[PDB]
Design an enzyme around this catalytic site. Structure first.
Site, PDB file in Angstrom:
ATOM      1  CB  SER A  15      -0.846  -0.038   1.235  1.00 27.50           C
ATOM      2  OG  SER A  15      -1.597   1.150   1.326  1.00 27.50           O
ATOM      3  CD  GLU A  28      -6.076  -3.009  -3.385  1.00 29.17           C
ATOM      4  OE1 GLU A  28      -6.054  -2.456  -2.281  1.00 29.17           O
ATOM      5  OE2 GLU A  28      -5.170  -3.774  -3.748  1.00 29.17           O
ATOM      6  CG  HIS A  88      -5.448  -1.335   0.995  1.00 30.60           C
ATOM      7  ND1 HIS A  88      -5.129  -1.274  -0.346  1.00 30.60           N
ATOM      8  CD2 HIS A  88      -4.520  -0.586   1.638  1.00 30.60           C
ATOM      9  CE1 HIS A  88      -4.047  -0.529  -0.508  1.00 30.60           C
ATOM     10  NE2 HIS A  88      -3.661  -0.095   0.682  1.00 30.60           N
TER      11      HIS A  88
HETATM   12  N1  LIG Z   1      -3.164  12.571   8.332  1.00 34.14           N
HETATM   13  C1  LIG Z   1      -3.390  11.495   7.590  1.00 34.14           C
HETATM   14  O1  LIG Z   1      -2.807  11.316   6.544  1.00 34.14           O
HETATM   15  C2  LIG Z   1      -4.351  10.457   8.054  1.00 34.14           C
HETATM   16  C3  LIG Z   1      -4.394  10.100   9.397  1.00 34.14           C
HETATM   17  C4  LIG Z   1      -5.287   9.122   9.809  1.00 34.14           C
HETATM   18  N2  LIG Z   1      -6.089   8.532   8.911  1.00 34.14           N
HETATM   19  C5  LIG Z   1      -7.018   7.498   9.358  1.00 34.14           C
HETATM   20  O2  LIG Z   1      -7.491   6.831   8.198  1.00 34.14           O
HETATM   21  C6  LIG Z   1      -8.188   5.645   8.522  1.00 34.14           C
HETATM   22  N3  LIG Z   1      -7.577   4.475   7.890  1.00 34.14           N
HETATM   23  C7  LIG Z   1      -6.937   3.612   8.703  1.00 34.14           C
HETATM   24  C8  LIG Z   1      -6.314   2.468   8.205  1.00 34.14           C
HETATM   25  C9  LIG Z   1      -6.369   2.204   6.831  1.00 34.14           C
HETATM   26  C10 LIG Z   1      -5.719   0.964   6.290  1.00 34.14           C
HETATM   27  N4  LIG Z   1      -5.321   0.029   7.073  1.00 34.14           N
HETATM   28  O3  LIG Z   1      -4.718  -1.152   6.614  1.00 34.14           O
HETATM   29  C11 LIG Z   1      -7.058   3.110   6.005  1.00 34.14           C
HETATM   30  C12 LIG Z   1      -7.655   4.259   6.554  1.00 34.14           C
HETATM   31  C13 LIG Z   1      -8.384   5.223   5.675  1.00 34.14           C
HETATM   32  N5  LIG Z   1      -7.922   6.365   5.370  1.00 34.14           N
HETATM   33  O4  LIG Z   1      -8.632   7.243   4.554  1.00 34.14           O
HETATM   34  C14 LIG Z   1      -6.057   8.861   7.604  1.00 34.14           C
HETATM   35  C15 LIG Z   1      -5.184   9.835   7.137  1.00 34.14           C
END
Ligand SMILES: NC(=O)c1cc[n+](COC[n+]2ccc(/C=N/O)cc2/C=N/O)cc1
Ligand SMILES: NC(=O)c1cc[n+](COC[n+]2ccc(/C=N/O)cc2/C=N/O)cc1
EC number: 3.1.1.7
Lengths: 533, 535
Positions: free
Chosen positions: B203, B327, B440
């Site tokens: 990833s 994904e 993912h």
């Molecule tokens: N500041 C940042 O780039 C940030 C910080 C925390 N998150 C929390 O995101 C939750 N999260 C937590 C874990 C995963 C994947 N895990 O395997 C994917 C995701 C989704 N993100 O949009 C996203 C961006």
């Protein structure tokens, strides 16, 4: 003087001819004038009702074909010539044909009114493929077909002007429709069961009648084969009509009055000669003089009218052929020909698309290309050729149809949709064109029933099925055969289920979604693209 | 020294290490864990490129994982395994630039091909010490020398004032690069063959791997690259210098902070403050967007990944790339309203259109409508299951599948030997709902051969499958070819080519070969969407 072949219509007496259909005689009344010859000062003008005549009008012979471009792309080729006028061209062509059963049916019979296609620039109600004898004989149908003025004669509009209001070809049809209302009873037609059917520009005409109030009282049901009032080709704006009328005037050496007066002075063929030079782009499936959104015949754009209309007490049969777009490729898309296999290159596909979607910005055209390219096989010429066809068909017929189907269904119309997938065994076009635009007509009309025509017996049976659907549709607004069960049922096209049937040699197969994804692109995305360039 | 296991004492450039004999199911492995490869990028070194680890004296104990790089701890589902397995499992510290080595035990006789794992975590999280990154299985079963490093994530790794000296951007990639440098110099001490170094990551780790492919100074540090569910191209793996500047300065403001003054101030801020505000700097409400990611600095990345994959020569390169079945599903639960792990996430058209804006945050109204138009099933435009899955597909396609597609395509078209997979097996152990399919990161445990740990409740087919995947990966690591050279009884994994576009399914079933990585839908994302943004 066969008394069955003698009819007093409102304008006077007619003598039909007893024509024979394979299963018996039919009374054909061909060449019945329904309007004053739109000649002289009557050029470009709404049709005036035919003046009564003395004696017995010989109605045993097809009348002249409305003055039109004769196709010359493949001279002597049956595939093109079968659409070419099979009678003398004349501006004096406002005639309709009535086939009835022989004898004249006892009770009022449903009437089918055929409106030919020809891109609003050609066609004639006299072509072999529109021979109504079969439906008259096998199905007891009173089958009417009129000539209406095509090209400049029918559709040169100087919108707003008195002398060239536009849409006169449609008014011609309307007049024939009036003529049927007032007269068809005399032939045992039921003026209270009149079903329009037409293909391609004829379908668009039908759709325009659906969308035009003064037309709505002249029929009860419509069939739109491979054409819609909506869509890229069937209409032009007032401004575009004016532009083209004006441009044609320039091209032939001509306020509206003086411009039209001059156009009135021009030999028919001069108008025709320069008819194609008025298209804004190198095009296929685009036609110079087509119905005009005039605020009059069409109060708004067909799109507008199909969006807002109330189509409650309307039944509509619509459909497409499997290869709406193939036919047109040979007439202006480099790489396409009836003669070779038209395996085209990628570049010829991108260019082909600019010609197929002439109204397209580079981005819209790229969108199309990127959409129709099979990316598993991006440069495969078979795919690209089939895609070029697909583009042209979807853009012009299939997606307009789906749109129309959906809009009519959503707004109360009972709708039956089909895709005609049977390629005529006798088809003179190359296999790659599959089932081209127009090549269902011969079947609907029942020509396979004429043994001399060399159609297979599977085809004769198919034609019978289709004539059954069409006339059942005509009779009842439902194309399903009550004297039959579950072989299987043709469901109404609805917006939810989006069901339509394949018409082919096998029994009806119900399919769902008439190129739903691709039509979403054309009907929903493409307008959004362009409506933000 | 003298009383202890003679096979655990290794010297590296910085000094003496004592590793640990770890039990893998099939026998013991040597692990050297928490080997420092950089000076703690602490204090004044925060945001700075890593400096080589100054040699230490005595025997450094390398028997336990070291600090995880200071990072945001996901807290959406507290106690839930599916989120916890990604969560730091060692102390959070900026002093975190430690790598890990697993080798056979005793250490391999002859130089063994080295696998370097770069973990994902959206560049804001991750740790080479997660259980799913456990190198013991690949080390024990495949004889592989597995190396994984911690690299700085979030601001500490990626906050950038492009141009500045004090926060040049990409330093987390530089930590990775430093660890690659470390492997080059030191891996032979473990029986690793520094001339056979395969990067693999999933990833952001995969994007990281890609960055290294794309960055000259990294090129000489590895020979082969595996990019699991991540690419350096695509809408999330990088930011422009301007956008990095924007987010850095915004983050600065958010914490109360001329680049030097700004960075200097940022350096006085406690790690947690930075983490606390890290996520507030994103230009839109979004999923699969991360605040501090590699920057196109014109240094590490001389140009956009898009540009470098389009025009680079990848002659010497073998690349194994691939995606999981689903994904996009993982990310839906973290900020698409409607979506949850706790229910079937059947959404409405409204929620889908809303989701699309969040999933494709960079999209204009028109571009979003295109996405929606594309992904709607117009037979069932309102159908909540389809919409739910389309939402998944949109996010997965947009962020992974299509970036991977462009990447595989461009790489193949430019001399790379590309092998492409889609990993379709949902761990029998998966604690996410069924609708999420194979999310993912859920192939990782298989690539790493966790299912081999009999105590992990995987099924026997999963054990076999893990072994197959381990074979593929290590074969690819050895030879640039996932295929078993003798074993043609098993179906062959053909190179991905622009012409044939072949990739394999990785599931319990023998390799099935498929054609076109969402070729139709990726034409939309990779070819149409850009144009729809050029106006
Ligand atoms: N500041 C940042 O780039 C940030 C910080 C925390 N998150 C929390 O995101 C939750 N999260 C937590 C874990 C995963 C994947 N895990 O395997 C994917 C995701 C989704 N993100 O949009 C996203 C961006
Ligand atoms: N009025 C003219 O001079 C004129 C009219 C029409 N064409 C081209 O017509 C050929 N044609 C003939 C028949 C069909 C329809 N077949 O189903 C379609 C087409 C063209 N499509 O772009 C050229 C000049």
């Amino acid at each position: 003087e066969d008394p069955q072949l003698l009819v007093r219509v409102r304008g006077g007496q007619l003598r039909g001819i007893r024509l024979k259909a394979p299963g018996g005689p039919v009374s054909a009344f061909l060449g019945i004038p329904f309007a004053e010859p739109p000649v002289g000062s009557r050029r470009f003008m709404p049709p005036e009702p035919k003046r009564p005549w003395s004696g017995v009008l010989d109605a045993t012979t097809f009348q002249n074909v409305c003055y039109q471009y004769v196709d010359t792309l493949y001279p002597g080729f049956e595939g093109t010539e079968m659409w070419n006028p099979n009678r003398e061209l004349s501006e004096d062509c406002l005639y309709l044909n009535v086939w009835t059963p022989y004898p004249r049916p006892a009770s009022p019979t449903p009437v089918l009114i055929w409106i030919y296609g020809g891109g609003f620039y050609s066609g004639a109600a006299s072509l072999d493929v529109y021979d109504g004898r079969f439906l008259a004989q096998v199905e007891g149908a009173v089958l009417v077909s009129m000539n209406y003025r095509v090209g400049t004669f029918g559709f040169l509009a100087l919108p707003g002007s008195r002398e060239a209001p536009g849409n006169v070809g449609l008014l011609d049809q309307r007049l024939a429709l009036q003529w049927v209302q007032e007269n068809i009873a005399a032939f045992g037609g039921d003026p209270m069961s009149v079903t329009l059917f037409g293909e391609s520009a004829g379908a668009a005409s039908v759709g325009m009648h659906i969308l035009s109030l003064p037309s709505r009282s002249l029929f009860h049901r419509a069939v739109l084969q491979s054409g819609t009032p909506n869509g890229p080709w069937a209409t032009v704006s007032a401004g575009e009509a004016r532009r083209r009328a004006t441009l044609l005037a320039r091209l032939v050496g001509c306020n509206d009055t003086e411009l039209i007066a001059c156009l009135r002075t021009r030999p028919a063929q001069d108008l025709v000669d320069h008819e194609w030079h008025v298209l804004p782009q190198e095009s296929i499936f685009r036609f110079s003089f087509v119905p005009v959104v005039d605020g009059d015949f069409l109060s708004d754009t067909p799109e507008a009218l199909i969006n807002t209309g109330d189509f409650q007490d309307l039944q509509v049969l619509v459909g497409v052929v499997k290869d709406e777009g193939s036919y047109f490729l040979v007439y202006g898309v480099p790489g396409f020909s009836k003669d070779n296999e038209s395996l085209i290159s990628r570049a010829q596909f991108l260019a082909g698309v600019r010609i197929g979607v002439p109204q397209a910005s580079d981005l819209a055209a790229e969108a199309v290309v990127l959409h129709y390219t099979d990316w598993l096989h991006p440069e495969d010429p078979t795919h690209l050729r089939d895609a070029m066809s697909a583009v042209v068909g979807d853009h012009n017929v299939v997606c307009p149809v789906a749109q129309l189907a959906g809009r009519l269904a959503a707004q109360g119309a009972r709708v039956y949709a089909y895709i005609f997938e049977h390629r005529a065994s006798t088809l003179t076009w190359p296999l790659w064109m599959g089932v081209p635009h127009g090549y269902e007509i011969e079947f609907i009309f029942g020509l396979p029933l004429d043994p001399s025509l060399n159609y297979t017996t599977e085809e004769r049976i198919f034609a019978q099925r289709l004539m059954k659907y069409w006339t059942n549709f005509a009779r009842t607004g439902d194309p399903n055969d009550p004297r039959d069960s579950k072989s299987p049922q043709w469901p109404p096209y609805t917006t939810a289920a989006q069901q339509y049937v394949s018409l082919n040699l096998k029994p009806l197969e119900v399919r769902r979604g008439l190129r739903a994804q691709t039509c979403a692109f054309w009907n929903r995305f493409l307008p959004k693209l362009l409506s933000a360039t």
